[model samples]
Target: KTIKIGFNFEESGSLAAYGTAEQKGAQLAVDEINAAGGIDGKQIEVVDKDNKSETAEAASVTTNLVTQSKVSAVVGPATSGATAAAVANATKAGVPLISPSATQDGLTKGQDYLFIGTFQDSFQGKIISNYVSEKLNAKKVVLYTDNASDYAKGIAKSFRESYKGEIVADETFVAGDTDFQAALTKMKGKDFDAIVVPGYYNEAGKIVNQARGMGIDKPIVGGDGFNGEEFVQQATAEKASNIYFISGFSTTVEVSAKAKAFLDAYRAKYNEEPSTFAALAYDSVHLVANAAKGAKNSGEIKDNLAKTKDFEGVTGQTSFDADHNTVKTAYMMTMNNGKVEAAEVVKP
Candidate 1:
């Protein structure tokens, strides 16, 4: 019997910018596995579908993967919003899904078919909050978020709950909104020690650029959504200075030897630095591919995934908790001269 896998990835729509990296990472893992004489004498086959960043489209794509593709297991839907749709379909269909980039809190709620190798938004938020409270001595804060997306809302909520400082201003915006002059205008003279913006790098870069232009000279704290190479290109290095964010892994930083191997291979294959999201996607597939070899029944992949521990992935030592969330350490990074320089590691 052939073992087929499905990726409910983002090939189109707004989220497609990040999804391409995940797909490329997963493809690398598949290539490696096929080079190693395949899994149990059966070469892994991958079925790809575009979720289009829509819940309805995600559900339809997942149904196609399950019914038409007949995949043994599935991976991805790269964003949290899309994951919700795909998870609902995959769970009912009893196909285990190893999601690499859905970081919203409570995403794994009441789901047996889902497993995520990345920490939840709250986990990363705690790290940022602690760093601010202890390291930066942040006393006053300002928050800006896109209230429209679950990813933004979740990170904002987590930061607020974990923060123990003064909130000078809490602002909300719609996703895809390019103008921030009005919001920055309102926050012009605030006594904020730091500003927290929970959104993708595209929005974060613009927010920082505009905020600096409007003389809002405060450090910006962000989540994994800030993981991208375009922040410096889109926004000037001067604007991105003092920008701090939490991530699962960074190829620039020295992790364990195992992580180094993955990074070197990824760089050789892709000719670009791999993001933490890509590392998680690569490792998630390897985890599943390894488990599928030892699984007594293919139906037990979900439970087997929960048993994953001490996975020396390209990120770091990854282990799943009861919530199917990885409790691995998160790195605190600062943008210096258009590069993400590692500052500290907060062990969870």
Candidate 2:
């Protein structure tokens, strides 16, 4: 017997990188489980659907996954808006949908079928605020936000509310905006010890580079969107100095035995280091498989997933809270040119 599972993630479009990484990690996990004799002697059949990074399409694919494909459980929709859009459909079908990296607050609130595989934005936002204030010793900072994305805006919101320091200047940009000269120019001479860009790596990289070119070099920080290696190339290492972000996983950090094994396995399989998104997805799949061991249907899978506690995986030990959000450790990462390293572990 083969138990079907669905992968609803962005396989194409602007956010393709995250979903592609997720698919790779998820595939690796599936392979591992099968090679080790699979769940209850049944192989896992993964049904993949590309959401195209659109909120509307996320719901469509989610419905297709649960109804047409008849998956017992599903993983992904890696961004907040997309994951949030997929929630109602999965819930209506009684199929569990676990997001790999959509950490915006309230995505899992009051939902029994939806789940988060990463720490929430509130936790990451607080970590960045604390890092800038306690470690970077910045009492005043500038904040840049992406008005178009729920994930970015959510991170900005949490940071603004939790930060102990003053936000000397606040700037806004839409997700697709490439130029930051006007806003960067405005904050050029502002008095601030650090700058926080709570956006994805694509925009964050450009902002950091533009900020440096504008001669606004103080420390820079961001949320988990900063975890990928693309940010270093975006800011180009030398300029990426003194930059940090909060994340759910870091391959450069000293991790648990289970995590180390995952790193090695990923390296050998992909021939490149797996991104934080990949690790989160890998962990998410294992979380599902662990719950799906003896499940006869999606509803049974949902119930088992809700009871998950101290589930160990590559991302560290995680458990679902009352609201179906993952309770786990967050990593504070440092970017030095092309090198991304885990500097510390931050708790919720």
Candidate 3:
């Protein structure tokens, strides 16, 4: 007998990078577990339903996974948009859906069968809020944001609420805008110690490049979106100094025993540095397997998952709250000229 696990992920689309990394992690965990005589003498099998990074596709795929494939549980699509779609389908079907890196508050907020493998956006918001006040000791700062994303707007608002400093300028920009000169120049004239950009990297790299080019040398901080290679590539090494952001994990920081093993194992297979999503997905697989070790169906898996307490994995210890939201430590990462230094862990 074999327990079948299903994956709802992006095989081809804009978010393929996240999907690819997560796929690698998921496979690695399964391979390791199966190599060790399987789980409870039953081999574990893996199946996939690529959603093409589409919310609509994810919705349909979840139905197929739960009903047709009859998988015990599903590791969800990476993005919040697609995850929500899968969450709804899986919930209605009474199946367990665990999202490795979705992080949207509403995804798991009140859903009984929905689960998140990482902290929500508000967690990062509060972390950055306190970072600005306590770490940088900034009494005044600029809030440059991508007005298009609630991820950005919400974080900016959360930061504003908790930050001890005054917002010198609340600047905004739409996503995919390459030129930030107008807003950068406007912010350059202001007197502030730091700039908080609670948005994705597509625009963040450009914002940082423009801000640095304009001689606004204050520490330019952002959220996990800045952790991507595209951000570093876009910003260029010349303008990448003093770049700080909140992250789930950093290769440079000290990690748990399990994390070190995962790091070594992942590096043994892939030459590149694994992203946080990789670790997140890896942990999600272990979490599911650990919880469903002797389970017969999805309900048992859901119950075991909800009772997950102080479970140690690659990222850190994860304990699911009543809302199925996991609170793990956030990393304060500083990237100077494409190098990771001062990667410190911040506890929630």
Candidate 4:
């Protein structure tokens, strides 16, 4: 019997790039596992669906995957908003939904069936705040957040709580508002060492470009939302050099042999370097397969996933804690001459 796993991702909307990478990564992992004779000789199949990058659509898609597709377990609804929309339905149906990139800290609270493949926003925020204050020796910082995203707001809130530096200014803009010159102008003369933009690449890139253009050369830091090529493309090398973000994996950094193999395979399959998004999703698929080994039902798979510890993956050694969030180090990366460079690894 084939073990069907539902893969819900945003394929055609705001977060399409992330969803596409996740889909490719999940498919590659499934292919590799099946080629290796699968789990206990039972072939694994991915029942994929596109959530269209809408919150309401995410819930509807999750319901269909659980009630109609009848998959053993589910992976993704990549963004934090979409994951929040789908989590309730998955929990109600008793299906385990493990997200690859949803980093909102509150998503998995008290939800037995919810798990995350990457670190939570709280850890990401703390790491960024500490790095700015300790590594960069920053004394004053400013926060610029996307008002519409829970993921962005969560990271901003965590940073505000954990940061030791004095906050100079806190500003916000809704998603899709491309013109940020006004906000940048207002923050031009602020005595801030760095500006933390806890938002997606789309907005972060523009902010970086505008800030640099306005002679605000302060270091710009962010979370995993900055892990996209579009960021580099939007903010050219000159503007992107001082921008940094926390991620789970870096292709340029040294890794375990397994991770090396995964990286090579991903590049060969996709003809491009894999982002943290892809790496985490690839790990998520493999982790689910490993957990489902010899499992009789979704409940058993959930139990096995909860017991996962020191699971070597392309990202890092992932160990699920009490909240089912992976406990691992995050890579601090910055753009240099139009390329992503791994600066350091931060541990929580």
**Maximum-TM-score candidate:** 2
lDDT of each: 0.80, 0.85, 0.83, 0.86
What's the distance in Å from true for residue 185, model 1?
1.5
Between candidates 2 and 4, which one is better according to lDDT? 4
Task: Give per-residue CA lDDT, model 3, range 81-108, as digits (tens).
Answer: 7887788778877889888988666667
TM-score per model over all chains: 0.94, 0.96, 0.91, 0.95
In model 1, the runs with Cα more than 4 Å from the true position are 252-254, 294-297
**Residue-by-residue lDDT tens digits, candidate 4, 83-116:** 9999999888888999998887767888899998
The true-versus-predicted C-alpha distance at residue 175 of model 1, in Å, is: 0.7
- Residue 86 error for model 2, in Å? 0.6
C-alpha lDDT (0 to 100) for residue 135 of candidate 2: 86
Better of 1 and 2 by lDDT: 2
Q: Of the pair 1 and 3, which is ahead by lDDT?
A: 3
For model 1, the local distance difference test gives 0.80
lDDT of 2: 0.85
- Better-scoring candidate (TM-score), 1 or 4: 4
Compare candidates 3 and 4 on lDDT and give the better one. 4
Task: Summarize candidate 2's per-residue lDDT along 45-156 as a digit string, tens digits.
Answer: 9898999989999999999998898888889999988998999999999889999888888878788898888888778778888888898898999998988877777778
